[PDB]
Design an enzyme around this catalytic site. Structure first.
Site, PDB file in Angstrom:
ATOM      1  N   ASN A 160      -7.349   3.910  38.098  1.00 39.63           N
ATOM      2  CA  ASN A 160      -8.653   4.638  38.510  1.00 39.63           C
ATOM      3  C   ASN A 160      -8.227   3.896  40.397  1.00 39.63           C
ATOM      4  O   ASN A 160      -9.514   4.896  40.733  1.00 39.63           O
ATOM      5  CB  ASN A 160      -9.528   4.693  37.700  1.00 39.63           C
ATOM      6  N   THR A 161      -7.950   3.243  40.424  1.00 41.60           N
ATOM      7  CA  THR A 161      -8.233   3.189  41.623  1.00 41.60           C
ATOM      8  C   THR A 161      -6.752   2.362  43.035  1.00 41.60           C
ATOM      9  O   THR A 161      -5.765   2.045  41.483  1.00 41.60           O
ATOM     10  CB  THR A 161      -8.878   1.522  41.903  1.00 41.60           C
ATOM     11  N   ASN A 178      -6.487  -2.872  29.554  1.00 45.06           N
ATOM     12  CA  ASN A 178      -7.447  -1.509  30.126  1.00 45.06           C
ATOM     13  C   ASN A 178      -6.735  -0.804  29.057  1.00 45.06           C
ATOM     14  O   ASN A 178      -6.132  -0.495  28.419  1.00 45.06           O
ATOM     15  CB  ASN A 178      -7.347  -2.068  31.553  1.00 45.06           C
ATOM     16  N   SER A 228      -6.875  -1.308  35.685  1.00 47.56           N
ATOM     17  CA  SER A 228      -7.508   0.190  35.316  1.00 47.56           C
ATOM     18  C   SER A 228      -7.148   0.216  36.623  1.00 47.56           C
ATOM     19  O   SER A 228      -6.312   0.830  37.580  1.00 47.56           O
ATOM     20  CB  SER A 228      -9.196  -0.068  36.229  1.00 47.56           C
ATOM     21  N   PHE A 283     -13.977   3.399  39.697  1.00 45.96           N
ATOM     22  CA  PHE A 283     -15.038   2.203  39.997  1.00 45.96           C
ATOM     23  C   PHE A 283     -16.334   2.573  40.859  1.00 45.96           C
ATOM     24  O   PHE A 283     -16.689   1.453  41.634  1.00 45.96           O
ATOM     25  CB  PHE A 283     -14.383   0.640  40.305  1.00 45.96           C
ATOM     26  N   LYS A 318      -8.026  -9.447  33.794  1.00 41.58           N
ATOM     27  CA  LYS A 318      -8.593  -8.906  32.835  1.00 41.58           C
ATOM     28  C   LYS A 318      -6.371  -7.377  33.422  1.00 41.58           C
ATOM     29  O   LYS A 318      -6.012  -7.255  34.316  1.00 41.58           O
ATOM     30  CB  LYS A 318      -8.631  -7.314  32.948  1.00 41.58           C
ATOM     31  N   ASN A 333     -10.379   8.049  32.042  1.00 45.83           N
ATOM     32  CA  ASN A 333     -11.314   7.844  32.734  1.00 45.83           C
ATOM     33  C   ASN A 333     -10.798   8.386  34.333  1.00 45.83           C
ATOM     34  O   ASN A 333     -11.319   7.802  35.212  1.00 45.83           O
ATOM     35  CB  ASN A 333     -11.727   6.481  32.435  1.00 45.83           C
TER      36      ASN A 333
END
Ligand SMILES: Cc1cc2nc3c(=O)[nH]c(=O)nc-3n(C[C@H](O)[C@H](O)[C@H](O)COP(=O)(O)O)c2cc1C
Length: 350
Positions: free
Chosen positions: A176-177, A236, A174, A114, A207, A113
């Site tokens: 992706n940020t 994650n 996560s 918000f 998480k 891969n």
């Protein structure tokens, strides 16, 4: 597998968009939802257990990222997940990372891969919805807000969705940020976590990412017990590209790979976390769960609950149920009476 043969060729995001639409229409017709339930409804009653002050008819659930905006809440009961978690939501609506944001890795059966509509759209869905199963909420920092203003974002979101949720998950994991994984540091996390705990009575969880050092995870576990948080969610998506078996990985670029490669880390994390803060807080094992014997190694390692994303794309509709009956078999084969009993059996016998 022919549907998959037809479906794997179209781009994964576009394929998801269509699959998503189809499940949203199945929730429109109540009898067919009942009927899909009436096709694989008998869930062995032993599987049911209560965790962190919320009970769960089954241990397997959908990991965040499938329905981020909470449009198909009703559909998931018929698919046979024990619990649901709405995808990660930021208070202010954020456009996700631009395309192409999703890639396929066939041979390892893994994905890389918000994007959200905000806590507004979710709360509206939660203002007219009868929950067949317990629904969870994953909260995240809006990309636009700076690190200083982040603690207010995490707080502001928590009040909106808090009362209408069964449990809250704080997403600092996560990749992706930008600069979110850094928040996982204890001193920054305490303001975020303490603020959320005060704002709503519903149990809150955090998480964690699997790409963190062993010493760091032991410190984050000590924060949770002090904060008296409900649970820790492991893990994650991982940034590491090691172990992959689908070609052309290097080009695909930034992202977090998810699925079977992640499994070995998620177990190790679960093993460590359960020994330290097993009794004080619940553990949910997420990432790289695809078979009943895989899930069995998680339950026996102290995972009170189990969520997964990748399994569904490859597994299909039966996949949810086959895990349950597989676990239910092991529970009868172990002489267990419920789920809580078997939790951490592999660890206690040590
Ligand atoms: C393509 C993809 C995107 C995801 N995006 C998010 C996300 O944005 N936020 C989140 O909280 N979880 C997200 N998840 C869920 C986590 O990745 C999941 O908890 C775990 O790390 C991987 O689950 P799996 O290996 O069983 O698929 C996503 C999962 C996938 C497969």
């Amino acid at each position: 597998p022919l549907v998959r043969r037809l479906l794997f060729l179209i781009p994964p995001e576009h394929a998801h968009k269509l699959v998503f639409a189809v499940l949203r229409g199945v929730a429109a017709v109540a009898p067919v939802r009942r009927l899909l339930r009436r096709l694989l409804g008998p869930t062995d009653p032993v599987l049911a257990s209560t965790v962190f002050g919320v009970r769960f008819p089954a241990p397997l659930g959908l990991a965040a990222g499938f329905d981020k905006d909470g449009t198909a809440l009703s559909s998931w009961g018929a698919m046979g997940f024990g619990y649901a978690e709405i995808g990660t939501v930021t208070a202010h609506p954020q456009p996700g990372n631009p395309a192409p944001r999703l890639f396929r890795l066939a041979d390892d059966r893994a994905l890389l891969n918000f994007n959200n509509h905000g806590a507004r759209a979710l709360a509206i869905r939660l203002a007219r919805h009868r929950p067949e199963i317990p629904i969870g909420v994953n909260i995240g920092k809006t990309k636009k807000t700076p690190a200083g203003d982040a603690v207010n974002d995490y707080r502001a979101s928590a009040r909106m969705v808090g009362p209408l949720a069964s449990y809250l998950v704080v997403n600092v994991s996560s990749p992706n940020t930008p600069g979110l994984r850094d928040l996982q540091a204890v001193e920054s996390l305490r303001p975020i976590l303490s603020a959320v705990r005060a704002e709503t009575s519903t149990p809150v969880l955090v998480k964690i990412a699997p790409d963190l050092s062993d010493s760091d995870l032991d410190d984050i576990a000590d924060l949770a017990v002090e904060l008296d948080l409900a649970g820790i969610v492991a893990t994650n998506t991982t940034v590491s590209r090691d172990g992959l078996t689908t070609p052309g990985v290097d080009r695909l670029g930034p992202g977090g790979i998810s699925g079977p490669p992640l499994a070995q880390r998620a177990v190790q994390v679960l093993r460590r976390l359960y020994d330290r803060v097993g009794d004080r807080l619940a553990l949910i094992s997420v990432g790289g769960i695809e078979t009943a014997d895989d899930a069995w190694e998680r339950i026996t390692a102290g995972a009170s609950l189990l969520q997964g994303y990748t399994g569904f794309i490859y597994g299909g509709e039966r996949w949810a149920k086959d895990i349950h009956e597989g676990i239910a078999r092991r529970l009868h084969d172990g002489g267990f009476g419920s789920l809580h009993e078997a939790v951490g059996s592999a660890r206690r016998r040590q």
